Structure formats: C-alpha cells, structure tokens
Design brief:
By secondary structure, the protein is an alpha/beta fold. It folds into three domains: about 375 residues, no CATH class; about 250 residues, no CATH class; about 120 residues, Immunoglobulins (Immunoglobulin-like). Helices cover about 30% and strands about 20% of the residues. Strand 14, helix 21 and strand 15 form a beta-alpha-beta unit. Helix 16 packs across helix 22. The protein starts with 7 loop residues before the first helix and ends in a 7-residue tail after the last strand. It binds beta-D-glucopyranose (BGC) and magnesium ion. Its main location: periplasm. Pfam families: Fn3-like (PF14310), Glyco_hydro_3 (PF00933), Glyco_hydro_3_C (PF01915). Belongs to the glycosyl hydrolase 3 family.
C-alpha cells in the first residue's frame, strides 16, 4: 500500500502535464543546474548577487531546466537577496516553461546559507541529546527560516551511520547507531515537512534523506572510496533510517556518491528501484549527488561516455540529475530516448515524480512569495531552542574531585586553538561549504572566550592560546601556526584552573580526509606542558571526529566533549561549566582510545573474548540517578506482541537535571552471531532533586528480530536480556518467525 497517500487532484494535473509536454520539457524537468552557471559574477562582485539574463535564457528558456541548487557566490546571502533571486528565476520559469523551478539548498543545521539565521548543533550533537522533540523543533525552525528566503527544498536530513571515525562526514549524521539515526531522521522530517506530506505549508520544506546508502563506512576512511558492507548490515542497519523516514513520508532521497561491491550506488537498480521505490510503494523523488552521473564515466569507468552514464543512471531509477554544470545532459538524454535506450515509460515516471514534488510544495500556485511575514526569523524564541540543543548535546566525560562546576570568582586560564572562534564551533556547512568564513558572518554570536567572559568577567579570564589554527588557504583545515607553548605555561601561575580547547578546525567532505586520527602533536604537547605546572586541567573537545587522545586524558581532571555545537555552543559551555545548566548529553558514538583498536558499541562477542576511551551512551552530570523496578507486561512474547517496559528513575543528588533513559537488548543465542548489545528505545525525562518518575518505553516483539545470513528478518525462540540504565531483566520469545517480505511491519 502507498507510504504517502495518493492525492487524485495532483495525479490528474500530472497526467495532463505529461499528455501536453514536449520531450525537451520532460527532459528539462530531470535536469538540475548549480547557481554559478546562471550567475553574473563580475556584476555580483561590484553590486551584490546578480543573475545573468542571457544564461537564464539558455538554461531555463532553451533547455527548459526545472531545478537550480546551491548558494549564490559560494557564501550565505541575506533572505531578501534569496527572495529577489528566486523571484526572477520563477518569473522566467513560468514564462518559458509554465512549470515552477524547484530550488534546492543545503540548509544542514539551520540555515547554512542564509545570513543571520538560527544555527543549531550539528547532527552528531543532536544524536547526543537523545531528544526527539528537540530535533523536531530544530528542523521546524530551519524550515521556517529556509522558507523566509523563498527556498522550498532542503538537502537534509543526513542519516548515514557514523560508524567510522576516520570519515570527514561522521559529524553530519546522528552517530554510529541505526535506531538513533532512524528516530532522529524521522523527527527532522516531521519538523521540516509538517504533518501532511501532500500539502507542505508556508513554514515547512520538503526534506531529502542523504546519502542512500552505506556512505559512512568506506574501508579506507577516505570519502567516496569503496565500502564493503555485509548483506545483513545493509538491510538491518544502513537501510533502517531510510525505511523509517520513507514510511513517515519523506518526499525525496539523495543517492550515495560512492561504491560498494564494485557498483557505484548511482548505478544500483536493485537498491534504487526495488528496495526503495517498488518495495515501499513510494512516489517521491530520487536526486543524484553532485556530478555523480558523470562520475560513472570519469571517476569509476563503468561508462565509456557521459551519455552511456546517463543511460545507466536514469534506467537505474534516478529522477533528477545534479549535473550540475552542463545543459548537455539534456542533449544526451534526448538522443538516448530517440534511440530507444531509455523508454518513455521511464522518462514519464521521472517527470511525474518531479511534478508531484512541485505540487506538494504549492509551487504552481505560489512559485515565490512575500517574505515580510516570516518575522520570527533569527528571533530570541528560536535562539533559546538552539541554546537548549547545544546545552543538551555537550557531554561530560570526566569530572574528578567534582572540579566542575567552577565557582564564580575563580581565575581561569583559557588555552588551545578552539578557544576563540565560531568556525571551530560550527564545522562545515556553515556560512561557506568548508565553514572557513564563519568568523566574518558570525560576529553576533559568542565564542568560548566571549561566553566565559560574560559568565565569569573578562578580568577573571586569562586567554593565552599557545597553539592556534593557521589562516585559511586551500582547505588547510589541519594546519596550525608554530606553537608558542612557552606563553600559557608562564601565565598559569596566575590561574586556579586551566581549560584547554582542542580538536579540529572546520572542513567538509573530501578536503577533510585525514591521514592520521591521532590528535595533532602540537595540541598534545600543549596539554603536556600545561599539566606540568601542577594546575588542574579541563579538556574541551571541539571536533568533527574523535581524535585519539589516550596520552592526555590521564593528565586532565575533567573532559567535556562539545563536538560541533555551533553558534550557541560557547554560551552552552559557559552555562554548563558554571552549573546554571546541568549536563544531560550522552555519547552517540564510541570514542576510540587506540588507533588500531576501533570498534562500535554493538560489536560481536568474538571481538571481546575491548579497550576504548568512552562508550556509546556514556555521560556524566552534576547529580546522580537510580534506576529501579524494571518490569515488562509480557515477559514471554512473540513477534506480534506489544512489549511495554516501565522503569522508575529517581534523581538522588542535589540539583535538577534531565536523564536520557536508554533501553538495550541482548539476544543470548542466535543463528547469526548476535550483537553483544543493541539500543532499542530511549526517552528523556526531567527530574527535580529527590523526584522519581515512571518512564514507559514500548517495543514490538519484532524489534528484537535480526537479518539472518540469507537476508531475511527473523525473530527466534529463545532468551533475551533487557538492560535499562543499571538494571537487567530476562524475557523469552516463545516461537520463531521468519519474514518472507523484504521488510517487517
Ligand atoms: O551540495 C549538494 C550536494 O553535493 C555534495 O557535495 C554533498 O555530498 C551533498 O551532501 C550535497 O547535498
Ligand atoms: Mg536467540
């Protein structure tokens, strides 16, 4: 049955577009071109962003191109500028084609490419909140502020499995667990789109699930190099968030640029047409990632010509090509259709999907609109939500002697290269693609230094970085200036405590590839030199990947992992360090300790017959929580039962906080060697000092199924254990079920 209901009025409109459209118009609707192609750059340098009328005439008038993407001039623009540009684009599209353009933008964590928007912590941070509602509210705000520039389509959310800490895109998704990505991805989709996928309202956008699928586990750790994914992992884990999002009505999917089992995913008919469109009966849009049809020819050599690559990818089930420079795509596809290599059935289906999306977004009736009414843009109300997200994502990993919180009045030596910059805090997909320009445009927001000054007074903060990042040149995200560790060491005698901010500078995608996961040698020497002053040290980790720090964690009294908390991350940190907020974040991935002992939390028991830095689900706070009375309604169950778990959680310390309650399962014996432990549900609860609450968490029996060797889901007769916080119970499945459908439920 269709995952998104059929709107007959939309289908009727589509049928009558398809009867009347020229082949050139149809092909144009399957083509997407990046904004640079239609930009007048010399006039833009002098007078601000300006489109080229002549190039619009070519792209839209002659070739009938149905979609544009990307940020004008490679840098975030004012919403007024966005709106003026999209207006001109739509006036042209309605005049020459009669079909409105769909403009896609990478608004990744709030409005990446719209100035003065509300910027949220990155995906990995949102995972660490274990707060679905907060993720939803973040996406709702991003949608609102995206539509404030007349943009209807966001290339988000990202639901790759961040299971490889070498990978430059580990931070874009919600971490290493497939359940966390599925649930948060669904929360983002609901926020972005609203509750009716057929009528995306004024303040909502179409979501795009990225990057279908298995993108996050390249064998070498290098971006867009081959993964080697097992049959069971592909169905059970990598597919899981896409399955969940599509069933909630996500309107579009972007395909994985990379390769597995010798096949680029853009050429994988089975995964695109069968697993996605046909098995789920899903009428949404599949779009390529950047240049990926041409990559079949030039990068991977599975096509002799670009034209042969078009044939392969379109026949594999792609609907729209992110070319993104060459209107010649249209010529090639037309030739293929005339030759009989690509059928009209396939062209008509692609165009149906493009038009359907456009109708769902109301673009025929409202191709652009007045933006005056979007008066909550950049508001205090929206910022308080981003601040909450940031507070809830920053993880307390170590606190010996309860050195935190730090009392107002103590003198703080602030050190390290991540201590005074918004570029660090944001990472990539922030004002520019690499994030390199963040400090030019993020002056209204607080760096770590600025926030600590507001909390403790400028007079109580001594800032001597010792090590700083070099100025931007050719994606030198790794490069630091010569260390001057001599300086903060000398200044230490005047401080009570040292906070050292370390990790990475901003990068995005392939330029962010690393050759050594170990934290920078200069950064490690800075921490060692400071340790030897005898003053206590608090490490602040600000990075897109968990850099190896096994030699410096023993020298630190406390450690806070902020990951990429973005524009309110400095404020959040200061609020947490002073106890005005209480820590609640938990690790959404496994932090490795040794460079050739990398592992995820759901390892097979042969892997621990297990030496890591901090595990998945770990996080401290300024209070403690007791779990008791773990019960279930049906201790003996089958696939079709609803299991209802309850547990009492009591705040036994002296201050209020939020506890993320995680529910894990363990299959003791199975026909495939079972994951040692698996997250199955979670729920976050607020508790005052001394307060108990009964937390309810529900599962279907079939949630304890796994994908067997033969590719089929099975729930087997036998024993399981359930772990919730500190507490364990026994349950029994009383009968085996094997599914003949590709998916459960
Ligand atoms: O910018 C459009 C697309 O281009 C590619 O570089 C990235 O992999 C995608 O995440 C992005 O949505
Ligand atoms: Mg079993």
């Amino acid at each position: 049955s269709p995952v998104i209901p059929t709107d007959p009025a939309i289908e009727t409109h589509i049928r009558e577009w398809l009867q009347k459209m020229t082949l050139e118009q149809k092909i144009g609707q399957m083509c997407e071109i990046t904004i640079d192609v239609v930009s007048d750059l010399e006039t833009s340098r002098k007078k601000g962003f300006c489109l080229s009328e002549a190039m619009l005439d070519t792209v839209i008038g002659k070739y009938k191109v149905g979609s544009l993407l990307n940020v004008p001039l490679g840098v975030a623009q004012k919403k007024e500028k966005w709106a003026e540009a999209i207006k001109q684009i739509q006036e042209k599209s309605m005049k020459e084609i009669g079909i409105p353009c769909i403009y896609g933008v990478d608004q990744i964590h709030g409005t990446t490419y719209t100035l003065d928007g509300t910027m949220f912590p990155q995906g990995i941070n949102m995972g660490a909140t274990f707060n679905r509602e907060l993720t939803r509210r973040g996406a709702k705000i991003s949608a609102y502020e995206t539509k404030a520039g007349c943009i209807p389509w966001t290339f988000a959310p990202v639901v790759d499995l961040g299971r490889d800490p070498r990978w430059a895109r580990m931070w874009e998704n919600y971490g290493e667990d497939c359940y966390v990505n599925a649930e948060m991805g669904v929360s983002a989709v609901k926020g972005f789109q609203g509750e009716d996928p057929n009528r995306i309202g004024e303040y909502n956008v179409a979501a795009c699930m990225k990057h279908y699928m298995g993108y996050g586990v390249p064998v070498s750790g290098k971006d867009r190099t081959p993964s080697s994914i097992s049959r069971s992992d592909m169905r059970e884990k990598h597919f899981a968030p896409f399955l969940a999002a599509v069933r909630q009505g996500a309107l579009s999917v972007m395909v994985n640029s990379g390769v597995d089992n010798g096949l680029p995913f853009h050429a994988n008919r089975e995964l695109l047409t069968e697993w996605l469109k046909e098995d789920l009966n899903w009428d949404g849009l599949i779009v390529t990632d950047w240049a990926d049809i041409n990559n079949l020819c030039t990068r991977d050599h599975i096509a002799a010509t670009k034209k042969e690559a078009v044939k392969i990818v379109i026949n594999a089930g792609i609907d729209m090509s992110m070319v993104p420079y060459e209107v010649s795509f249209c010529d090639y596809l037309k030739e293929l259709v005339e030759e009989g290599e690509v059928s009209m059935e396939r062209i008509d289906d692609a165009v149906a999907r493009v038009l359907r999306l456009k109708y769902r977004l109301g673009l025929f009736d409202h191709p652009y609109w007045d933006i005056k009414k979007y008066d909550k843009f950049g508001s205090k109300e929206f910022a308080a939500v981003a601040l909450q997200a940031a507070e809830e994502s920053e993880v307390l990993l170590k606190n010996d002697g309860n050195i935190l919180p730090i009392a107002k009045g103590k003198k703080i030596l602030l050190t390290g290269p991540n201590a005074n910059s918004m570029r660090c805090l944001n990472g990539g997909w922030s004002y520019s693609w690499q994030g390199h320009v963040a400090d030019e445009y993020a002056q209204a927001y607080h760096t770590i230094y600025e926030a600590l000054c507001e909390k403790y007074g400028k007079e109580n903060i001594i800032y001597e970085p010792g090590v700083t990042y070099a100025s931007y040149k050719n994606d030198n995200w790794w490069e630091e200036n010569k260390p001057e560790t001599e300086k903060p060491v000398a200044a230490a005698a005047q401080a009570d405590i040292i906070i050292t901010c370390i990790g990475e500078n901003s990068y995005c995608e392939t330029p962010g590839n690393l050759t050594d996961l170990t934290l920078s040698e200069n950064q490690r020497n800075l921490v060692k030199a400071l340790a030897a002053t005898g003053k206590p040290i608090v490490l602040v980790l600000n990075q897109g990947r968990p850099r190896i720090i096994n030699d410096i964690v023993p020298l630190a009294k406390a450690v806070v992992n902020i990951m990429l908390p973005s524009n309110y991350g400095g404020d959040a940190l200061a609020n947490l360090l002073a106890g005005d907020a209480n820590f609640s974040g938990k690790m959404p991935f496994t932090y490795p300790r040794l460079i050739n002992a990398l592992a995820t939390y759901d390892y097979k028991p042969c892997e621990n017959m297990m030496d890591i830095q901090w595990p998945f689900g770990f996080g401290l706070s300024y209070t403690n929580y007791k779990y008791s009375n773990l019960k279930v309604n049906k201790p003996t169950f089958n696939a079709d039962d609803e299991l209802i778990f309850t547990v009492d959680v009591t705040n036994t310390g002296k201050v209020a906080g939020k506890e993320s309650v995680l529910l894990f399962s363990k299959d003791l014996v199975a026909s495939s060697t079972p994951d040692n432990i698996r997250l199955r549900n979670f729920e976050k609860v607020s508790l005052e000092p001394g307060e108990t609450k009964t937390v309810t968490l529900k599962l279907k029996g079939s949630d304890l199924a796994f994908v067997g060797y033969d590719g089929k889901w099975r729930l087997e007769k036998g024993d399981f254990k359930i772990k919730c916080g500190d507490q364990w119970m026994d349950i029994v499945c009383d009968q085996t079920k094997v599914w003949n459908t590709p998916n459960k439920n």
